[PDB]
Design a protein around this ligand. Structure first.
Ligand code: FE2
Ligand code: FE2
Ligand code: FE2
Ligand code: FE
Ligand code: HG
Ligand code: HG
Ligand code: HG
Ligand code: HG
Ligand code: HG
Ligand code: HG
Ligand code: HG
Ligand code: HG
Ligand code: HG
Ligand code: HG
Ligand code: HG
Ligand code: HG
Ligand code: HG
Ligand code: HG
Ligand code: HG
Ligand code: HG
Ligand code: OH
Ligand code: OH
Ligand code: OH
Lengths: 341, 340
């Protein structure tokens, strides 16, 4: 029931963001929600090339760091690398099959494309600071701490993908497969979509932002500056991605786009809240590990933890969730010099 | 059984291109096949923004055209729009979920991304030459002739997607779904993938080049040079897209990748052959519609038909197939200028 070109003539301005008729014609002269076209344009105006950034002095900087500083750095790098591996493919594989408006379709492909460039930038850094990048790359997959910090990201995507396949193959219903009853419900699939979006919004809004705080800590010190320039270009793209997820979520709950989606959202608020908090907690628990055999100079477990709280509150308010934490002003205003967005 | 982040630590240098373990880590320090890394680098090096191309004059030029030349121009643009509309999403939705090596995975995401830029370029041309793009765009879906020429593109893709879903959900075997037997054979899915690919190769290498010809015809009479700059940029990218499909196809047949794939390529050859013949006849048939209200000095069903046979033979030979048409010199050598 999924089609690469639906032959029905339809008003693309009247479809919902998700679950309506798959997009046929790709046109950009008009949009239901212009935010998406605006986001495609800015992201294209931001196009950059990693290799164009000189990281030649980062190797010695890294060599000269203290062992626990190498640890904090490399470790944070491995996490950023993991998130972008996932983000390079997921939005395409997970969302494309469910989008019903063209501007949203292309924004998703552009967004995913910008993420592959981030991944290439990490190969650029890694290749220039270590002797055998393979060590770093292998560690990303099995590293217990990161599977830990990043736990449940791949799973929200995976289940949504699975459910979408059943929905496209069998459609709404109670069916049977190899002696098992399999129930397919649109509403539960819309809930799966909603929660997956929420989780990608936290990935973009928080998980990535926390990593920036670590990278920029080195930059503040004039250390690993090739990495810093690259991370600055990345945070600028991240700002657009988060705008995109905020808008999709806000349009969904507001009921304007899909009445049923607004109901689903509302009824799942506490579920939504807990994930957000759960996510903040993961980032804190990791700030823990990273700082235990030693603590960086200008950042530490407590400062990072305060930062996790501060941004989390900002992000949750943005999509109408309650503030889980104590209100406080930014603990590391020096970060602003690097977050040009 | 499809996963966005496979937790097994695998030597990505040893996976087949497709059907292996899904890619986890996206690294570009090494490649099983460096041709894909090279296409990624070249494509990124060619990054361009349509709206920056000056199409200002094209509106006068267009208004000045005889209605039949207008018909010919627009009907062409419309098919072009259609092919990039499908190519923008297709490679991601059909291929991504089956790729098992990082370079090819990112190559496909980069290729698709470049097609959405092609589509942006048509919206830029259309809005700068007509009063309501909506007529043109609404005319694409329902245009039977358009639809007739494109027949079978969306279908190969959609069927491959459905089988892939069954594969991911049930795994190989014969299963019982809603009281019916469904068979999921990997060999079979691999055949569907292989033919999809062959079909995409023909889409990139033959269907698009015929459209360029028609596009460039105007440019030779010094008309619609805004559209020509864009078509030239597009042509530049399509050449990378076709080099990517040819390699994928040739690598699979060489038996250097998945061996089973090399026997499928051999067993399917007549099918590969027949699909090119059909696409070719489809392109010839279009001519009857393009030239509805008349031809133009230098471009007619006749020249179109010969160009079709000409390029088809070159593309089939590139993937090791027999040439169905008579050999002949390029019937429109002035095209090479714009092609490079
Ligand atoms: Fe990223
Ligand atoms: Fe991002
Ligand atoms: Fe294209
Ligand atoms: Fe192409
Ligand atoms: Hg998601
Ligand atoms: Hg998700
Ligand atoms: Hg950090
Ligand atoms: Hg740090
Ligand atoms: Hg941090
Ligand atoms: Hg929720
Ligand atoms: Hg919510
Ligand atoms: Hg949430
Ligand atoms: Hg905290
Ligand atoms: Hg294909
Ligand atoms: Hg195909
Ligand atoms: Hg043509
Ligand atoms: Hg032509
Ligand atoms: Hg073949
Ligand atoms: Hg074949
Ligand atoms: Hg002919
Ligand atoms: O990002
Ligand atoms: O194209
Ligand atoms: O193309």
């Amino acid at each position: 029931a999924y089609t690469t070109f639906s032959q029905t003539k339809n008003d693309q301005l009247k479809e919902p963001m998700f679950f309506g008729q798959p997009v046929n014609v790709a046109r950009y002269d008009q949009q239901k929600y212009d935010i998406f076209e605006k986001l495609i344009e800015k992201q294209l105006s931001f196009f950059w090339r990693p290799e164009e950034v000189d990281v030649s002095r980062d190797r010695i900087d890294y060599q000269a760091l203290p062992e626990h500083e190498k640890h904090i750095f490399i470790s944070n790098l491995k996490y950023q690398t993991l998130l972008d591996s996932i983000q390079g493919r997921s939005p395409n594989v997970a969302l494309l099959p469910l989008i019903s408006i063209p501007e949203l379709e292309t924004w998703v492909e552009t967004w995913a494309f910008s993420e592959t460039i981030h991944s290439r930038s990490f190969t650029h850094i890694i290749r220039n600071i270590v002797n055998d990048p393979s060590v770093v790359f292998d560690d990303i997959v099995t590293n217990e701490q990161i599977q830990k910090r990043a736990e449940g990201i791949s799973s929200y995507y995976d289940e949504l993908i699975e459910m979408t396949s059943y929905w496209h193959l069998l459609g709404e219903g109670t069916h049977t497969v190899n002696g098992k009853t399999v129930t397919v419900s649109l509403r539960e699939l819309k809930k799966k979509l909603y929660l997956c979006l929420m989780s990608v919004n936290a990935l973009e809004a928080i998980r990535f932002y926390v990593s920036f705080a670590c990278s920029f800590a080195f930059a503040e010190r004039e250390l690993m500056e090739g990495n810093a320039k690259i991370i600055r270009l990345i945070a600028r793209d991240a700002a657009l991605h988060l705008t995109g997820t905020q808008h999709m979520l806000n349009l969904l709950r507001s009921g304007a786009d899909d009445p049923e989606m607004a109901e689903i959202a509302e009824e799942c608020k506490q579920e939504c809240y807990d994930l957000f908090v759960q996510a903040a907690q993961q980032e804190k628990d990791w700030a823990d590990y990273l700082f235990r055999d030693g603590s960086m100079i200008g950042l530490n477990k407590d400062i990072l933890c305060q930062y996790v709280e501060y941004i989390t509150n900002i992000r949750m308010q943005a999509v109408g969730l309650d503030l889980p934490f104590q209100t406080r002003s930014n603990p590391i205003p020096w970060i602003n010099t690097w977050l040009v967005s």
